[PDB]
From a paper:
TFG functions in the early secretory pathway by regulating the transport of secretory vesicles between the endoplasmic reticulum (ER) and ER–Golgi intermediate compartments (ERGICs). To perform its role in clustering vesicles, TFG self-assembles into homomeric cup-shaped octamers via interactions encoded in its N-terminal Phox and Bem1p (PB1) domain and a subsequent coiled-coil motif. Within this region is an LCD (residues 237–327) rich in proline, tyrosine, and glutamine that functions to further polymerize these octamers into larger assemblies and phase-separate. Mutations in the TFG LCD are associated with degenerative neurological disorders such as Charcot–Marie–Tooth disease type 2 (CMT2) and hereditary motor and sensory neuropathy with proximal dominant involvement (HMSN-P).
The mC-TFG-LCD-G269V fibrils have a uniform morphology consisting of two protofilaments of the same sequence (although one has three more residues resolved than the other) but slightly different structures and interacting through a class 4 zipper interface (parallel, face-to-back, up-down packing). The fibril has a pitch of 578 Å, a left-handed helical twist of −3.07°, and a helical rise of 4.93 Å. The fibril core contains 2 protofilaments, 1 with a wide core of 29 residues (P262–G290) and 1 with a narrow core of 26 residues (P265–G290; 3 fewer residues resolved). Each protofilament consists of a single dagger-shaped β-arch and constitutes <30% of the LCD. Moreover, as a participant in the only hydrophobic interaction in the interior of each protofilament, V269 contributes strongly to the energetic stability of the β-arch and at the protofilament interface. For the mC-TFG-LCD-G269V fibrils, we found that the fibrils remained present after being heated to 70°C, but dissociated after being heated to 80°C.
Numbering used by the authors:
A (entry chain I), B (entry chain M), C (entry chain Q), D (entry chain U), E (entry chain Y), F (entry chain 2), ...: 262 to 290
P (entry chain 3), Q (entry chain Z), R (entry chain V), S (entry chain R), T (entry chain N), U (entry chain J), ...: 265 to 290
């Protein structure tokens, strides 16, 4: 029972911003 | 029973923004 | 029983926006 | 029993928008 | 029993919009 | 028993719109 | 029962921003 | 029962920012 | 029951910033 | 029951900054 | 029941700064 | 019940700074 | 019940500074 | 019940400084 | 109940400084 | 005024269709 | 005025469709 | 005015669809 | 004015979908 | 005006979805 | 005006999703 | 005006998700 | 104006998520 | 104007998450 | 204007997270 | 204007986290 | 203007974290 | 303008953390 | 303008941390 | 302008930490 869990989360509020891209890599096997 | 879980989430509220693209890669096998 | 799960989610409210494209790649086999 | 699941979701409310295109690729076999 | 599932969903409410096109590609075999 | 399932859905309500075209490609064989 | 958990989280409020990209790598197997 | 837990968190408020990228690597096996 | 826990946290408020990147490595096995 | 705990924390307020990167290494096994 | 605890903390306020990087190493086993 | 505790702390206020890096090593086993 | 405790602390205020690095080593076992 | 306690502390105020590095070694066992 | 206590303290104020390094060694066992 | 949208999957069955209704009252 | 959207998965069953309703009252 | 969105997974079952409703009252 | 979003996982079951509702009152 | 977002995991069950709601009152 | 975000893990259960709500009142 | 974010772990259970809410009043 | 962030770990349970809320009043 | 951040560990339990809130009043 | 950050460890329990809040009043 | 940071260790308990708050008034 | 940092160790308990607050008034 | 840093060790207890606060008034 | 740093060891207790505060008034 | 550094050892107790404060007035 293999269950790898990867959470990549970006959020912002009240006159904010995020510029960077999201590039995650998950390798099983 | 192999269940890899990848969560890529972007959200924003109240005069906010996100610019970066979402490019995730999942490899099984 | 192989069940890879990939979640790519963008949302925004109250005068917000998202500019980046969504380009996910899932490889099984 | 192979069941790969890919969820690409964009939504917005209350004077919001999404500009990026949706281009997901799923490879089985 | 091979059942790949790809969900591409865009929706918006209350003075919102989505501009990007939907171009998903699914390859089996 | 091969059953690939591709869902491309656009909807909007309450003074909303969607501009992008829908161009999905499904390849079996 | 192997369950590796990786949390990558960026958020900001009240006239703030984040510039760096998110590039995490998870290797199981 | 192996459960490695890695938390990478960046946040900022009230006219602040973070510039560095997030590049964590987790190796199990 | 092996549970290694690594916490990498950067935050700042009231006209502050952080420049350095986050590059943690966790090795189990 | 092995539980190694490593805390790497940088924060600053009121016209302050941190420049150095965060590169911690945890080895179990 | 082995619980090694390592705390690496940098903070500053009121027109201050920290330049040095954080590179801690924890070896169990 | 082995609990080694190592505290490495740098802080400064009111027009101060710290230049040296933090490189602690903890060996158990 | 073995609990070795090592405290390495540098701080400064009102136009002060610390230059030396922090390199403590703790050996148990 | 073995509890060795080592305190290494450097501080300075009002136009002062400390140059020497901190390199303490604690051996138990 | 063995509790060896070693205090190494350097401080200075009002246009002062300390140059020498701190290298204490504590051996129990 | 009552509006009911119900999707019910009985035992040993599979339902794949998404559920996305629009309900306007008043 | 009551609006009910209910997705119910019985025992030994699988439901894959997302749940995304839009409800406007008044 | 009451709006209910309920996702219920019975015993020995799997639900995979996300829950993302939009509710506007007044 | 009451808005309820409820995700309930019964015994020996798995729910994987995220919960991300948007609620506007007044 | 009351807004309730509730995620409830019953006994011997697993919930993996994140909880990230947006609530605007007035 | 009351906003409630509640994550409840019953006995012998595991919840993995993060809790990150945004609440705007007035 | 009351905003409540509550994370509750019952007996013999594990909660792993971080708690990071943003609350704006007035 | 009252804002409550509460993390409660019941008996024989483990909570691992950090607590890092941002609260703005006035 | 009252802001409460409370971390409570009941008997025979372990809490590992750090407590680092940011509170702005006026 | 009152800001309360409270970390409470009940009997026969362990709390490991650091306490590092930032409080700005006026 | 009152700011309270309180760390309380009940009987037969262990608290390991450091206490390092930053408080700005006026 | 009152700022209180209090570390309290009850009977038969151990507190190991250092106390190092920064307080700026006016 | 009053600033209070208090470390209190109750009966049959041990406190090991150093006390090193920085207080700036005016 | 009053600044108080107080270390108090109750009966049958041990305090090991040094006391080294920095106080700037005017 | 009053600055108080007080170390108080109650009956049948041991205090080992040195007392070394720095006080700047005017």
């Amino acid at each position: 029972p293999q269950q790898p869990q990867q959470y990549v989360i970006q959020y912002s509020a009240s006159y904010s911003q995020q510029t960077g891209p999201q590039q995650p890599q998950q390798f099983q096997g």
